Structures are given as C-alpha cells and as structure tokens.
C-alpha cells in the first residue's frame, strides 16, 4: 500500500456517542494490520488516533464506517 514501511499517525472521526461504542471502535481499529496503539481524543471524544507501521488507511476507514455508520479520515501524518 501507500504507507508500507512508514510509521504513521492516522486520525479518524468516528460516531461513538457512548463508552460502549468507544470501546468497540477502538478494538476495531486495533484489529487492523499494523496498528500498534489507538487513542480517543477531542473534547467530544469523537476522534481515534491510530498509530502503527504499514497501516492500510482505506481498510481502516471502511471497517469503522461499516460498524459505526459514520467515519471520516481527517489526516495521515508521519512520526
């Protein structure tokens, strides 16, 4: 893919209006190949920060979108 071998931070806005859906969305992101850590951020706790190496961002957003309805990729960045 486009980020093969690269350490990326990927920020996704996800519909997660309660603690149950936040736990579910983090676990979903964590299941994507290459993901090392997931963090919930934003004052409304509505963004996942996904960090890893070789992450396929297409697969990550597609999976979040299918299981939570709304998910949008805000940025991909190196670190």
């Amino acid at each position: 893919s486009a980020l093969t071998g690269q350490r990326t931070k990927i920020v996704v806005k996800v519909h997660m209006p309660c603690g149950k859906s936040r736990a579910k969305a983090m676990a979903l992101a964590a299941s994507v190949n290459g993901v090392d850590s997931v963090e919930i951020t934003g004052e409304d706790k509505d963004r996942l920060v996904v960090v890893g190496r070789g992450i396929d961002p297409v697969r990550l957003v597609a999976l979040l979108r299918e299981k939570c309805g709304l998910a949008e990729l805000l940025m991909v960045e190196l670190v």
Binding site: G19, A23, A30, S31, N33, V35, D36, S37, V38, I40
Partner: protein, 62 residues
C-alpha cells in the same frame, strides 16, 4: 486482528488508550517498558503514572 493481545489502559476512570501485543512481547507504553506474558497479561499492572493495564486475547482468538 493481527496480534494476539489487546492491552487496555485505564486513566482517571476511563479507557482512552489500547495497545496491541503478541504473547511474550515487550512493548512500550509512553516511555514505560511493558511485558505481555503468554496469557496476554501486562506487567507492570500499575504504571509509574498510576494508570492501570489490563490485557486479553483478541476476539479473533489466541
């Protein structure tokens, strides 16, 4: 799921961080070394910032 274990980190009453790990892997959470054993349990349980670690196999099996 691509690794054996999910490690949850409780801070100030909530889980806002999780980490992937294989059995018997050493990982780093922030600047802290963590050992995840063969039952996916993390050590140390209490990190120096007093956050608490909990681990289990992913729902995609061991």
């Amino acid at each position: 799921a691509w690794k054996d274990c999910i490690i949850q980190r409780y801070k100030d009453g909530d889980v806002n961080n999780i980490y992937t790990a294989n059995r018997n892997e050493e990982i780093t959470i922030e600047e802290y070394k963590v050992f995840v054993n063969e039952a996916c349990h993390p050590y140390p349980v209490i990190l120096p910032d007093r956050s608490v670690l909990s681990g289990d196999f992913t729902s995609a099996y061991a």
